[PDB]
């Protein structure tokens, strides 16, 4: 009902800076709470740096839910949103 189908999604296909910041913060917190890491870590130890490395490779297992003003929403995977 409220969910919007993937074919009719009309929001921007890019990761906004607020979404990028929130995704990085959440992923860093989850890694700091011993969540599995989906990318190989060479010598990195900072959770934020690991989160940035995951984001650059489109490996973050999170979904953005963008709320339209009327209450409907669109679910975008972080692996399908374009990041600068």
């Amino acid at each position: 009902e409220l969910a919007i189908l993937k074919e009719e999604r009309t929001t921007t296909p890019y990761l906004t800076k607020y979404e990028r910041a929130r995704i990085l913060g959440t992923r860093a917190l989850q890694i700091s709470m011993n969540a599995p890491v989906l990318v190989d870590i060479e010598g990195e130890t900072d959770p934020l740096q690991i989160a940035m490395k995951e984001l650059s490779q489109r490996k973050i297992p999170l979904v953005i839910r963008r709320y339209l003003p009327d209450g409907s929403y669109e679910d975008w995977g972080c692996d399908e949103l374009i990041v600068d």
Binding site: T10, T11, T12, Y14, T16, K17, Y18, E19, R66, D84
Partner: protein, 113 residues
Amino acid sequence: PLPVNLRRIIQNAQQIFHLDRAKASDLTIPEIIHGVRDLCKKLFVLRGENELIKEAQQNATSLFQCLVRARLATRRILEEFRLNRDAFEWVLGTIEAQFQRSLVHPGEMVGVI
């Protein structure tokens, strides 16, 4: 004040591709015309196939399209800037990407700003 600086893009292309020398360009006129015409339809401010959405999208970029067509005219490209092909696709791609980067981000608290 208008988005994406065109003069900077053009001189960057000239420096990148070494567009000096009296060498003749290989850029055909139909490529110029069709490339600029197609570029003026990929500046997405609003997504959607709705007719009212298309009308709003066309309205939102009138001044910028006027700027782009003023700069990237056929005579100016072939004579004043002397771009070749590769410089031309590079300029078109750069214009499109920079315009996409210059939009406002949903979630701005523009009232406080």
